Structure formats: C-alpha cells, structure tokens
C-alpha cells in the first residue's frame, strides 16, 4: 500500500509551506533510518540534498535522476506519514555508507557495553 | 565580549527558548557555528528514545536529533549532562543511523 521510507531511499518532500522557501519543486532527501523504525513511528531520519555543491566537508556526491549532493551534517527527523514522502530512487551503497560514516564523527560514542 | 561555545555534553538553552543536549565536538561547534543536538521536553511518556536527565529542573528526545545554528540563534549554557546520559542518547541514535548497525539491514 502506502510507501514507507527505508534506508537509502532518495525521497522528495515538500518545502514546509510555513518557512518561506522561494525554491521551486520539492526538497530531495536521503533516508538514513531503517524501515522498521520508519514504519513503526511514521518518522524517519534523513539528510537533505542540494543541487549546488560548494565544497563543504560533509557534502556527499550522489551519482546516478537529478544531480545532487547530500548534506550529511544536516540530519533531521521527517514526519513522512503526516507530511508525505515520495520515493524517486535509491542512492549507491557507497554513498549511503559515506553519509553515515561522516555523521559518526558528530555522534561518536564510547566503546563499552551498556543498556540502550 | 566572547560568546559561549557549546562543548560536547553541554545542556544549552536556544532561542527557537528550548533546551537541547549538544552531541557534536567542540572543534566542530566552534568552527562551523553549528552543532548536532537533541531537544529536551518537560515530561516523559515512556517513549523508547527518551532519555531522562537527572534529576531536577529534562527529558531528551534522541530520535529528534537536529543540526542547529547555535551561534546565530544565541545559545546559553545551562550545564553539562552526565557521561552516562550522553552515552545513552548517542547509543540510541547509533541504533538508527550508525555505520556499525547499517550492515545488519543492508
């Protein structure tokens, strides 16, 4: 039935109509979190894509239907179930892994066993 | 004078005020004027991504991680979270988007 985002999906989401964006079309984004979480919560963690690279270090090039780069440090929770999401494609495994690898530098944890 | 720069583990108040826990390292926070943080809310509901901050007055919502322009917004320092609480927040995020777990799904 309804599409449910899964990790690696390249989705389109609406520009939030309250935030004043002057951009045309939709906002592309890469889904990071797994299907099971996304399905259960109606949310997903994603990074946004832009058409213009600028050479910043958290940029990950996406090769593959529209040119783009994912901004790996700009992770956000997206309410796909309430606000909508459309699947346009999937990113390469290497690109998905690179995005997650970069994010780890911002959320690196300690190396020990614990309850979580 | 010289504005406060968030460090990893700091509990900050951000003009959105909204409390948040800063996850990203000082080096990143200082260079970019951005930080990766998690917002806090007033009450717990038993949602699994909640992390209760001890002990007065602090419930962090781990799955609502967000990059915030602390420098432009004007963040202030409320204190620092206990190491165990910081670790728990990070671990819960890691389950969802960590490279180590990625390979258990694909």
């Amino acid at each position: 039935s309804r599409y449910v985002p899964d990790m690696g999906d390249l989705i389109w989401v609406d520009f939030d109509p309250t935030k004043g964006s002057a951009q045309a079309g939709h906002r592309p984004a890469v889904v990071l979190s797994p299907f099971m979480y996304n399905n259960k919560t109606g949310m997903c963690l994603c990074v946004p894509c832009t058409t213009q690279s600028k050479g910043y270090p958290f940029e990950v090039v996406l090769s593959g239907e529209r040119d783009g780069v994912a901004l790996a440090d700009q992770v956000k929770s997206i309410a796909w179930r309430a606000r909508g999401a459309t699947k346009k494609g999937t990113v390469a495994p290497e690109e998905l892994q690179l995005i997650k690898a970069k994010i780890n530098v911002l959320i690196g944890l300690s190396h020990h066993h614990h309850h979580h | 004078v010289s504005r406060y720069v968030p460090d990893m583990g700091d509990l900050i108040w951000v003009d959105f005020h909204r409390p948040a826990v800063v996850l990203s390292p000082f080096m990143y926070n200082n260079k970019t004027g951005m930080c990766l943080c998690v917002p806090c809310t007033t009450q717990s509901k038993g949602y699994p991504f909640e992390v209760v901050l001890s002990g007065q007055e602090g419930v962090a919502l781990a799955d609502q991680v967000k990059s915030i322009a602390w420098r432009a917004r004007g963040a202030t320092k409320k204190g620092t979270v206990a190491p165990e609480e910081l670790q728990l927040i990070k671990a819960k995020i890691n389950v969802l988007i960590g490279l180590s777990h990625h390979h258990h799904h694909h």
């Binding site: - | 004027g33 322009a69 420098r71």
Partner: peptide, 15 residues
C-alpha cells in the same frame, strides 16, 4: 511528543 519545531531556519541550517 510533538515533532519539535525550531521555527525559521537560521544561518547555515537548510531546513
């Protein structure tokens, strides 16, 4: 919990 809303994006926040 509400989906936390940070209001108008600022500085280098893209969304």
């Amino acid at each position: 919990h509400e989906n936390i809303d940070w209001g108008e994006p600022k500085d280098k926040e893209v969304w």
